[PDB]
Write a protein that binds this ligand. Structure first.
Ligand code: LFO
Ligand code: ZN
Ligand code: ZN
Ligand code: ZN
Length: 461
């Protein structure tokens, strides 16, 4: 049952205002036929245009909300809206384009999807709140058939060209006019009461209804993300490597070890309260400190309230004001003044970070993590952590071409001595690259106000 059976029933109540008289009893087989597509009984990788909620969740990077509003249905113009903010007007003769015939509109659709998706996914998933016109408009820009490969590479085909009779992936589709073998999901099939806006607005205040098709497309995709990644969570689903995932994750582990080790050396905290991932390991295994762990799964809806994290019911809590607290990707409303924090900035633009629900973002790196909206007021008791590199390892090369390093932030015995050694220069430069990688991916670092790297120099005596 990996794919959605074409013989599964499709509820048609949402379709009956654009398509009055539509049968209540309807399969995806008959719906696709009504839409003008012929599947011809084919076992060539495309069994159904529509997919299950589970298949959609695995292909969240391909999600594009899509809505169509009958501007005036063959005799009248249609407004095509996408979750990219684009509105196109197709004449039968928040970016708003003037009315144009389908032969030119379809070229723009292929260009927009290709630029949006080439670095995200091998396909497109149109996320719908289906009322009828969107389904009947698909024949004007979509072609279907057997699964194919690109004419210029090994990737699966996503576009077709009537000018050359060739197929292309999102990277090689310049000049292509048809979307080929797209997928789609109707959010209305999941069991909702009331219209799109009333359901969307229950969970999100960031997407207004500016009464255009793209606004509905944005709300539809937002509602879908809420249902699949906010109220329901699945960290076992794996997602392919599309960018700097491995380098980012490795940089995160390096930065965490560096920052925590320096905080412990600089302020000599007797206890560290590590709050977050129930599977966390000590990031500084050699530290003398009393290491205490507290379990909190990643919050996907609202940031944790610090009052609830330290609420111990009918028993006394641990002394959280003693020592230091470590919140490594544990999103809280207001960090305590004695903290070391790594907080993902949801506003960051990247191929790993997708738009989410209520200001939040869906960060997809190995697993999908819906993250609550970044809020500067969470850090009022802390300061931004400045870049620095610290090392107590011996000054010896072991085993690249050199230019001598001069830097006030290379905290080593050799720099204290007046001249940074080759080993520490190489490690400083590698660390700086890892640091820049993590920051540019969207992570932000915050620390208790008394943190001072000047206190690290006396660890070399
Ligand atoms: C610093 N945090 C804590 O000590 C606690 C947090 N929760 C939820 C507790 C439950 C029972 C006992 C202690 C705690
Ligand atoms: Zn290609
Ligand atoms: Zn929304
Ligand atoms: Zn050195």
């Amino acid at each position: 049952p990996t794919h959605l059976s074409v013989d599964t029933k499709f509820k048609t109540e949402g379709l009956c205002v654009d398509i009055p008289g539509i049968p209540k009893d309807m399969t995806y087989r008959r719906l696709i036929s009504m839409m003008g597509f012929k599947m011809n009984y084919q076992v060539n990788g495309y069994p159904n245009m529509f997919i299950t909620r589970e298949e959609a969740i695995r292909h969240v990077r391909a999600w594009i909300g899509f809505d169509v509003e009958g501007c005036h249905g063959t005799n009248l113009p249609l407004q095509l809206g996408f979750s990219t903010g684009v509105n196109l007007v197709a004449v039968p003769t928040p970016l708003m384009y003037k009315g144009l015939p389908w032969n030119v509109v379809r070229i723009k659709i292929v260009q927009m999807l290709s630029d949006t998706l080439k670095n995200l996914s091998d396909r497109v998933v149109f996320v719908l709140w289906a009322h009828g016109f969107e389904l009947t408009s698909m024949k004007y820009f979509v072609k279907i058939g057997p699964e194919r490969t690109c004419c210029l590479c090994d990737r699966r085909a996503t576009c077709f060209s009537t000018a050359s009779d060739t197929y292309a992936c999102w990277h090689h589709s310049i000049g292509f006019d048809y979307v080929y073998n797209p997928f789609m999901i109707d959010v209305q099939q999941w069991g909702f009461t009331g219209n799109l806006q009333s359901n969307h607005d229950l969970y999100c205040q960031v997407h207004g209804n500016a009464h255009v098709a793209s606004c509905d497309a944005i709300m539809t995709r937002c509602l879908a993300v809420h249902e699949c990644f906010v109220k329901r969570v699945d960290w076992t689903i794996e997602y392919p490597i599309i960018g700097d995932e491995l380098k980012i994750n490795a940089a995160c582990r390096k930065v965490q070890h560096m920052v925590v080790k320096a905080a412990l050396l600089a302020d000599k905290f007797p206890v560290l309260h590590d709050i977050g991932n129930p599977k966390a390991i000590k990031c500084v295994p050699q530290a003398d400190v009393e290491w205490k762990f507290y379990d909190a799964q990643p919050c996907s809806d609202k940031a944790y309230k610090i009052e609830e994290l330290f609420y111990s019911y009918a028993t006394h809590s641990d002394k959280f004001t003693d020592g230091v607290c470590l919140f490594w990707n544990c999103n809280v409303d207001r960090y305590p003044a004695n903290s070391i924090v790594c907080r993902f900035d949801t506003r960051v633009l990247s191929n790993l970070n997708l738009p989410g629900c209520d200001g939040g973002s869906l960060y997809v790196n190995k697993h999908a993590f819906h993250t609550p909206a970044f809020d500067k007021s969470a850090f009022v008791n802390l300061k931004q952590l400045p870049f620095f590199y610290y090392s107590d390892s011996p000054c010896e090369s072991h085993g690249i071409d050199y230019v001598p390093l001069k830097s006030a932030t290379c905290i080593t015995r050799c720099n204290l001595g007046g001249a940074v050694c080759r080993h520490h220069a190489n490690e400083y430069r590698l660390y700086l690259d890892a640091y820049n990688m993590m920051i540019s991916a969207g992570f932000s670092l915050w620390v208790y106000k008394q943190f001072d790297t000047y206190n690290l120099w006396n660890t070399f005596t």
